[PDB]
Design a protein around this nucleic acid. Sequence first.
RNA 1: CUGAUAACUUCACGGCGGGCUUGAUGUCCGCGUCUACCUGGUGAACUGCCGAGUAGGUAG
Length: 200
Amino acid sequence: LKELIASNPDDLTTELKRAFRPLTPHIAIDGNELDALTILVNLTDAKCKQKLRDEKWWASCINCVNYRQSHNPKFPDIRSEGVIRTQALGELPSFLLSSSKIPPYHWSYSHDSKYVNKSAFLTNEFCWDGEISCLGELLKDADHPLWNTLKKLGCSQKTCKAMAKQLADITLTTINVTLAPNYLTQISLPDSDTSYISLS
RNA sequence: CUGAUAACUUCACGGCGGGCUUGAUGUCCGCGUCUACCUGGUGAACUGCCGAGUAGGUAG
């Protein structure tokens, strides 16, 4: 929503740090991606990564979609040991609310304190012309645009892109919380007349 | 069968010093409140004597 006509607030560099992490609508790019990804590779480990993009590139930044999740079991008790990436099942009357009424794209990474700097390149949002989602869903095909920094930035060789294609095939259905043992809030209610249900 | 069960935040602490609000000021003119008017004691606590005695004691 903040395009290249007003992409420079000219105060300091908090705009990229604000627009990477989701609490707000996102910025749209067309071909000016080299302004972002020469900082993005140098976020971990500005026109310096051009012989060392190919290090810290094996599986570390790729593995952080498995720990990326839709729903957060660490609120407000952080020792929970989960990952939940499944939206809902059902629809409501209109006076009630849920996380179904609003678009599911603000998902992020909650696993570790030392791997905070590894949630880049696969958890953020681009918003090209609408249907705003994350990067792991729209990058599962062969013919894809905006690949100028794949044909030009020659440090990124073609040996691990197919692993990123085949590793993120099906992940929208995996749910695994384990109640033995953690700090998970668990509750019981009568759903039927006799058969209670211990939901969470 | 309650986002389940459990869950002692606390110790010390000097906002003080100084300060001329004043000057002047015509509220007045006029003005018919009037008419009418039963609070009643049914008959109802008497007749005498003494006291010089509107005071005081008696008999019935």
